[PDB]
């Protein structure tokens, strides 16, 4: 049941029920944005209908305008070696501040692209009116290693051991980063040297054992989104701090879900189903890609729904932050919000504001 201690847990019926009642609102804005987009690229209803025997040229101007704004908007972020800058508030700080700033800047510089990210950020903002950004954490592991060894203790003490142990202590003191890279035997003999007298020498013996899974991946992740696969509470006005639920539909595979160790009931999916042919489903990158598939049962494409929000898990009439994830007709995950800040891991920014509304207006909404 995945949550036996929840007196009133939501069922798949209510979740899909709320999902339906919000598309009735979001469809208007989706059509509006589609109309806007069909003009900067001369397509669909943006293509003028002309008689045979007369010209059909059409000079783009919305695209012309956007090209001269993309760079002037994106530059003030990438013009510097690192984006952020952290400063202390009170003198008690300036150690935590320096440490956190350095860690964050390194993370952005290396792990995330930041280049593709900024480009997509500004472009979506300019030509769609709103930006949604999803923030999450990635943590991959299980890659087990083997062949441990064993060292026997030995009470032989000499002068070279004292020198080496002094040097190793100095290293562990002033360059803690390099300390784990010193040899294991001398390291463990070193802590034995304060466990007791300097007699310790730690002669090896040897053994074998298979444990100690390694964390192959442990970092943050930031994806922008597509605006066709996201549905928000429409009663929030324009706060997003009072929105009560957000639903996102994306696409994944059985192997990826299994690799990300955060799911249950994975064996009752029936991957011979969806075929990526359903109405509200993941709107693919293009139209041609709708016909692509893998026919491997391990890389076959699926559609997954996620629901973040607040609910009355008990009967107390008090809301708690929960997340629920399901595919097809099977519930795969139900949990309370696991992030340190019990909020929805999304950020919404409106390009040009509108009166009491989350979605903004595109730049070229008045040049048609």
């Amino acid at each position: 049941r995945l949550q036996p201690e929840w007196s009133n847990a939501p069922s798949l019926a209510q979740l899909k029920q709320d999902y339906q009642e919000a598309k009735q609102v979001t469809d208007e804005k989706i059509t509006q944005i589609n109309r806007w987009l069909d003009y900067m690229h001369v397509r669909g209803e943006g293509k003028p209908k002309t008689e045979k025997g007369k010209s059909a040229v059409q000079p783009p101007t919305i695209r012309k305008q956007a090209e001269w704004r993309y760079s002037s908007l994106s530059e003030p972020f990438l013009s510097s070696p690192n984006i952020f800058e952290v400063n202390p508030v009170t003198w008690e700080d300036a150690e935590s501040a320096r440490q956190n700033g350095l860690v964050l800047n390194q993370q952005f510089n290396t792990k995330l692209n930041k280049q593709r990210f900024i480009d997509e950020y500004v472009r979506a903002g300019v030509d769609e009116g709103t930006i949604i950004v999803k923030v999450g954490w990635n943590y991959q592991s299980r890659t087990v290693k083997e062949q441990v060894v064993t060292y026997e203790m030995m009470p032989d003490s000499s002068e070279e051991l004292a020198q080496i142990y002094q040097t190793a202590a100095q290293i562990r003191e002033e360059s803690p980063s390099e300390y784990p890279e010193i040899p294991e035997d001398v390291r463990l003999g070193l802590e034995e040297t304060e466990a007791n007298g300097i007699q310790v020498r730690a002669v090896p013996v040897g053994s074998e054992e298979e444990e100690r899974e390694e964390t192959v991946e442990n970092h943050p992740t930031v994806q922008v989104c597509d605006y066709n696969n996201i549905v928000i509470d429409p009663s929030c006005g324009s706060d997003f701090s009072k929105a009560k639920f957000l639903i996102e539909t994306f696409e994944s595979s059985y192997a990826e879900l299994k690799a990300d160790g955060r799911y249950k009931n994975l064996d009752k999916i029936q991957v011979e189903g969806q075929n990526l042919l359903s109405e509200p489903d993941y709107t693919g990158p293009s139209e041609g890609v709708r016909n692509f598939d893998f026919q491997d049962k391990s890389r076959k494409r699926l559609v997954v729904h996620e629901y973040w929000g607040y609910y009355d898990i008990h009967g107390d009439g008090v809301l708690h932050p929960i997340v629920a994830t399901w595919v097809g007709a099977v519930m795969i995950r139900m949990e309370e919000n696991p992030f340190p800040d019990k909020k929805i891991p999304y950020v919404v920014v409106s390009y040009i504001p509108r009166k009491r509304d989350l979605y903004g207006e595109s730049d070229g909404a008045l040049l048609i």
Binding site: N87, T90, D93, A94
Partner: protein, 97 residues
């Protein structure tokens, strides 16, 4: 305790007569040019104030420039720094003798 958690200074008592100032606080919008003016005035008037005593005051001023320039650790260290004299007073005693 909540105010201390932010300020990291000993709590200053509160006057029960007025709570919104109106007697002891002047409230205005801060702007960068006024900040620059204040910094320039402090620097200039420190550099040419005079031989006036109480160097504690000069330390307070210099610490305030630090704080305005956002190095609070240096600001606190300077404002709490205590100068110490050398052992040249021996010279004065010996010449007196």
């Amino acid at each position: 305790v909540e105010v201390v958690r932010i300020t990291n200074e000993h709590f200053v008592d509160i006057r029960r007569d007025d709570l919104a100032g109106n007697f002891d606080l002047k409230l205005d919008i801060s702007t960068a040019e006024e900040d620059n003016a204040k910094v320039n005035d402090l620097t200039f008037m420190l550099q040419t104030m005079g031989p006036n005593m109480d160097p504690m005051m000069a330390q307070q001023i210099m610490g305030q420039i630090m704080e305005l320039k956002k190095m609070p650790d240096f600001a606190k260290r300077i404002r709490e720094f205590q100068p110490q004299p050398d052992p040249i007073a021996q010279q004065k005693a010996q010449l007196e003798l």
